[PDB]
Amino acid sequence: LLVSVLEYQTAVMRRDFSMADKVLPTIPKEQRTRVAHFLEKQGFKQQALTVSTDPEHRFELALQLGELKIAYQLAVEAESEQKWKQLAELAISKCQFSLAQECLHHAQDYGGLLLLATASGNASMVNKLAEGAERDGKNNVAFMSYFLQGKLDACLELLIRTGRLPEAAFLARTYLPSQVSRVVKLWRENLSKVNQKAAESLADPTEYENLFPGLKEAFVVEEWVKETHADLWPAKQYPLVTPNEERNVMEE
């Protein structure tokens, strides 16, 4: 039981920091973590951070003090997803959204990245998130991120690649009428392996145009939407944008 640790703790308890600072260099490195835990519980978190030699305890103290630079450096050394998540929460609370983005990426928190990118209106971040989420098999975040950008072709290919051919056909008919015949052929081919009669019953709009009323008009509307909505609106114009529920794109 080191005298120097007890003298330091006694000096801190007496609030004689001038004596504590003289005793501190006499405390061996191995015991500094115990002294730092004592300082933290006494409410001297900032002094605990300077004394602590334990990278985990320094990380927790840096988070509680909001010392984002020290917490970041310790999170890089520790390679722990849980430390990156805690640092991301703190960075969001301090409005350091660039650091929060980096921490959420290291934590593989694709939900947090989507939340940050949609809040900031950062279309480039949403696109990188979509491609990243698609590579890491987070297909829900990938789909949402492509859909929010209006990248309907990427949403359609994602549904085809995941084997969701019925949902891909519904998406194609609703948003991409030009792609319907391609998706229905793939859907028939896949359904034929399970139920050949059900596969033959699916109408292809290329063979049976009469079963798809308005599809020819929908192709003209799809080209019109691609030409007129090519550029994303500035986020500040949101109050001026009619919600999609009130828009009849076929009439426009």
Binding site: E89, G111, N140, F143, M144
Partner: protein, 51 residues
């Protein structure tokens, strides 16, 4: 076996909005234990009750 694939319609847990003291409501273990002891517990997994 605990990593259920998160579906698009699954609830998003916002840990910042959850009160720290929400104990997950465990099922009443006494009543489950009594039903199990009497033999009236249908085994959850194997006997699909609609079999």
């Amino acid at each position: 076996k605990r990593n259920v694939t998160v579906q698009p319609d699954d609830p998003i847990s916002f840990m910042q909005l959850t009160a720290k003291n929400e104990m997950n409501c465990k099922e009443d273990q006494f009543q489950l234990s009594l039903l199990a002891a009497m033999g009236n517990t249908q085994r959850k997994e194997a006997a699909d009750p609609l079999a």
